[PDB]
Design an enzyme around this catalytic site. Structure first.
Site, short mmCIF file in Angstrom:
data_model
loop_
_atom_site.label_atom_id
_atom_site.label_comp_id
_atom_site.label_asym_id
_atom_site.label_seq_id
_atom_site.Cartn_x
_atom_site.Cartn_y
_atom_site.Cartn_z
N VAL B 78 57.53 61.58 118.23
CA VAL B 78 57.93 62.25 117.77
C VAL B 78 56.81 63.99 118.63
O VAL B 78 56.75 64.81 118.63
CB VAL B 78 57.99 63.24 116.47
CG1 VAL B 78 55.90 62.31 115.86
CG2 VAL B 78 57.41 64.00 115.75
N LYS B 79 55.73 62.90 119.53
CA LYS B 79 54.48 63.47 119.67
C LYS B 79 54.76 64.66 120.68
O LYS B 79 54.15 65.16 121.28
CB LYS B 79 53.43 62.21 120.22
CG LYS B 79 52.65 62.13 118.80
CD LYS B 79 52.61 62.89 118.34
CE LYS B 79 51.49 62.58 116.87
NZ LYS B 79 52.24 62.18 115.78
N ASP B 80 56.16 63.96 121.44
CA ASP B 80 56.43 64.88 123.12
C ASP B 80 56.67 66.11 122.65
O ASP B 80 56.73 66.78 123.83
CB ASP B 80 57.19 63.59 123.35
CG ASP B 80 57.68 62.37 123.60
OD1 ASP B 80 56.74 62.73 123.54
OD2 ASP B 80 58.61 61.84 123.75
N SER B 83 53.65 68.10 122.66
CA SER B 83 53.13 67.66 123.70
C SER B 83 53.73 68.17 124.65
O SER B 83 53.09 69.29 125.52
CB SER B 83 53.93 66.01 124.14
OG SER B 83 53.01 65.10 123.60
N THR B 110 50.36 60.99 120.96
CA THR B 110 51.00 62.29 121.85
C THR B 110 49.82 62.23 123.11
O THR B 110 50.67 63.32 123.78
CB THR B 110 49.78 63.22 120.98
OG1 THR B 110 49.83 63.11 119.20
CG2 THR B 110 49.99 64.53 121.05
#
Ligand code: HEM
Ligand code: HEM
Ligand SMILES: *Cc1c(COP(=O)(O)O)cnc(C)c1O
Ligand SMILES: *Cc1c(COP(=O)(O)O)cnc(C)c1O
Lengths: 498, 498
Positions: B78-80, B83, B110
């Site tokens: 989910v960090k993409d 990001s 992340t």
């Protein structure tokens, strides 16, 4: 005697130009993905067509280089497609009953898709794969609930010990079990003919000048190349075969020393039923080095997280599309993700161990400071404390001697760790700990050791797994504590001369 | 003194009911994915909403249980999202120049999204992550070209040795470097408010009765819960906090023994700026066991390949949506893939080693035949051959004695391997080998050893990594060669009595 030969020539009567109306096979169109997916299996297909921006031009391609990224499928490989199709067709066939056992010989991606689909649809699953394939595939499989059997990698497909043979022997010993047989099953190349090629065609708006794919079972390149020769006659089809396999044509290209190679999933000692070598316009040989180089490159340059076969493919593509010129486009198939290869081509240690990376090739690209003894860092012998010492006492000591951090070393001269002034104070102010408490309560437990004669690069690699590097006598004796920051401060000081 | 406090209370003046017109922030709508993706970064967002069919009902949920699967993003977490957003916003800010260095403290997801985006967009990258996070994250990062620095896991965020502290110290030592600061950056929860919540809302057609998410930085749950409280006031927001973290409200829930836990990515010793605890309607505590249990379960049952935090989340969800009844739906957030955890919760050995699986819990579900000595298999002492023996000669020997396979044992009594009659013959017929050649040319090299006193289950586990299991004296002495098939034949014979 029931063992069906996987290399049996195709009984398929398709030839370029037969009206599709004439085809006996059941055909399925790609369906629009819903708002809410009713199960995970619907996440197969509709894979992205992502452009290759850097790698193409670095090698002087005048064309547009596209990649069909198939590792975005639910099981993480192109095999998830056939894995679905096969099972679904096997349900319409009435051959596959609920609760039945599915047994498959595989490179392991097909096994993943199948075991996954089994987990979802309530089928028992047994996967037979070579000893060569990566342990990650095993971990995923065992997590999906599939039973796993391995076969020697030196086994011939003829011999009973090969994955095909073992699969069949298992079918013959087990009730309600079927072998979906990815090598002979029409569902496999039909999967690509019906969906993957429709996708590639839609995404490219009909204009496609070349396709390149690595050859496994041969389903992908076959299924695609048939629909391509029908709908896009100008397109050249280019196959990729590893050295040591027999797949390529003409036969002259196959003459080689090694019978084994590290790349997983592609190449075979036989020509599978589903492979149609007539639709392939030209063959290219790739090896292990090219493969892993270009895979790593795909990751570092294009940011595509993908496996080795993809590397072979692209490595071939940059050679093959050289004949292309501006305005033309070339599609390249990327089969699966890095997930499988984590401890293999992704790890530098394995790349060294298998000799694909020479230490020279690494060291040349590395900075000036790379080859230098750690001693040249200006280490200072730190004050050591016992694990049984008391907290506030340690603060008094550190401040009184002006030290900011101390390694905690045992009575026996065994280094147990580190305590820092900062962590102590912060921990105290918070009431997480008491001045009377053991210092152990706050120790950073993890570190690594080095000699005064080690290279700074060594220190770098270590500093990627640990914060603390304790340079140690070959002991209770710590010549210094080096962190990443300290190495920085060293180099940056060596900068302000020029 | 430049170190910005990550736990600084929010300066955000949003309160439920402020017209969106009043918002200072820059807002972006989700865009339709193209035919051809121009780069990989466009593969972020538009994640599937997949239904949970089994796990929901096994625990007696009367509701519809949905999962937003975020591991389908390009970087696999989910960090993409954040990001991308962060970097993109940092480009519109004019703060991020081409070629600049990005430094980030992170749980490591992340870091993956950021290093990826760097690889694509030509930014230098330096990631600082705790010593606790998995080596897979490190492998991926190093593959993406990011420099890696690690920090102790026992460090307080106040102390200089924490990832936040080390990040900042690095910013202060490095030219053209920025800290995108996921804890304070508005881009982060704005990412979820603008896209993720819009997605969840569209996919659910506006009807949503509950949302459950694990809390990291708090961007996900915050960003979602704000747009939810605006557009879907009835929806209850449920947070998940690991035991040992402080995130949950009220504070009573946080009182606990362990300060450390194995789950990666969620929980903290401080409340990040971006976390708005007011929008969260209720908090739940999860622990390591619940987490890994339910993660494994997600894989085995629903076929979702996902990480531990997801397990915590669902484990909470089955408790939380109990109050729901038929006709209502509950969305659950699944943060990242199994890719990160391969050698941790996915591996049974690690699960044992960390004591989440008791050997009892395993053995109870296991069959009748599981606890039995291998001796009871009816092994036969095989004929052994030297590595230097000649091929055709070995055939003569095997046929003359009626044996189908032989372990190849050294002159020194060291077992080098196996040769089988079948592989020999097949190899000869093919002309791959000569009757006069050394037998070594055809040896299957890989096998494993066991005692006559070992349990059959042990044999099973081994038979998942190797085809051959050589039961051996504690020697040159092989009491037997056991393959998977032979174990099958054993059990199936023990079946035909009842
Ligand atoms: C007009 C088009 C086509 C016709 C008339 C056709 C016809 C046939 C027939 C009659 C068979 C069965 C032979 C037998 O078992 O007695 C067959 C087998 C098969 N077909 Fe096709 N086919 C067509 C297109 C395709 C395409 C596009 C694919 C996939 C790329 C395909 C894949 C296969 C495969 C893998 C087999 C199995 C061969 C075997 O069992 O030995 N077919 N085909
Ligand atoms: C009408 C709606 C909103 C208004 C009027 C608003 C207003 C503001 C203002 C004025 C600031 C800056 C305070 C300063 O630095 O002097 C701020 C900061 C921030 N905003 Fe918003 N905001 C709104 C909605 C949101 C939403 C929906 C999010 C994300 C869920 C968000 C995320 C943030 C974050 C993370 C900060 C940083 C806090 C800090 O720097 O200490 N805002 N907001
Ligand atoms: C199966 C596979 C291939 C080959 O695809 P085919 O359709 O069999 O030609 C390539 N790479 C990987 C990783 C595979 O699993
Ligand atoms: C960051 C992260 C979370 C938490 O998401 P937040 O938006 O920080 O609350 C959960 N699981 C994993 C694996 C993460 O990386």
């Amino acid at each position: 005697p029931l063992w069906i030969r996987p290399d049996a020539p195709s009984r398929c009567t398709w030839q370029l130009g037969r009206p599709a109306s004439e085809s006996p096979h059941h055909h399925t169109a790609p369906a629009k993905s819903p708002k809410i997916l009713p199960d995970i299996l619907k996440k197969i297909g509709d894979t992205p067509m992502v452009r290759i921006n850097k790698i193409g031009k670095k090698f002087g391609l005048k064309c547009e280089l596209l990649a069909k990224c198939e590792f975005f499928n639910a099981g993480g490989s192109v095999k998830d497609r056939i894995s679905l199709r096969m099972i679904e067709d096997a349900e319409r066939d009435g051959t596959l009953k609920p609760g039945d056992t599915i047994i498959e010989p595989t490179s392991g991606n097909t096994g993943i898709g199948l075991a996954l689909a089994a987990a979802v649809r309530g089928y028992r699953c047994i996967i037979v794969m070579p000893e060569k394939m990566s342990s990650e595939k095993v971990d995923v499989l065992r997590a999906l609930g599939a039973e796993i059997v391995r076969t020697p990698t030196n086994a011939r497909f003829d011999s009973p010990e090969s994955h095909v043979g073992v699969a069949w022997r298992l079918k013959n010993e087990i009730p309600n079990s079927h072998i979906l047989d990815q090598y002979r099953n029409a569902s496999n190349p039909l999967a690509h003919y019906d969906t993957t090629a429709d996708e590639i065609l839609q995404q490219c708006d009909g204009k496609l000048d070349m396709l390149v794919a690595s050859v496994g079972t041969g389903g992908t390149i076959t299924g695609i190349a048939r629909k391509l020769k029908e709908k896009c006659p100008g397109c050249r089809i280019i196959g990729v075969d590893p050295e040591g396999s027999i797949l390529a044509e003409p036969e002259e290209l196959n003459q080689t020393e090694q019978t084994t190679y590290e790349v997983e999933g592609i190449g075979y000692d036989f020509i599978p039923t589903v492979l149609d070598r007539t639709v392939v316009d030209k063959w290219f040989k790739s090896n292990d080095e090219e493969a892993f180089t270009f895979a790593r490159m795909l990751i570092a340059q294009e940011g595509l997280l993908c496996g080795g076969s993809a590397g072979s493919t692209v490595a071939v593509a940059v050679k093959a599309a050289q004949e292309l010129q501006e305005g033309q486009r070339c599609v390249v198939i990327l089969p699966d993700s890095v997930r499988n290869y984590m401890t293999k081509f992704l790890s530098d240690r394995w790349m060294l161990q298998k000799g694909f990376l020479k230490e020279e090739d690494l060291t040349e690209k590395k900075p000036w400071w790379w080859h230098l003894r750690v001693q040249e860092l200006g280490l200072s012998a730190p004050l050591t404390v016992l694990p049984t010492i008391t907290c506030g006492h340690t603060i008094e000591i550190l401040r009184e001697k002006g030290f900011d951090q101390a390694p905690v070393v045992d009575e026996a001269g065994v280094i147990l760790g580190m305590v820092t002034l900062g962590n102590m104070l912060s921990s105290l102010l918070a009431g997480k700990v008491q001045p009377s408490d053991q210092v152990g309560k706050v120790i950073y437990k993890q570190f690594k050791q080095i000699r005064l004669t080690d290279t700074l690069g060594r220190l770098s690699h270590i500093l990627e797994m640990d914060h603390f590097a304790l340079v140690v006598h070959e002991r209770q004796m710590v010549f210094g504590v080096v962190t990443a920051i300290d190495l920085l401060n060293f180099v940056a000081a060596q900068e302000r001369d020029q």
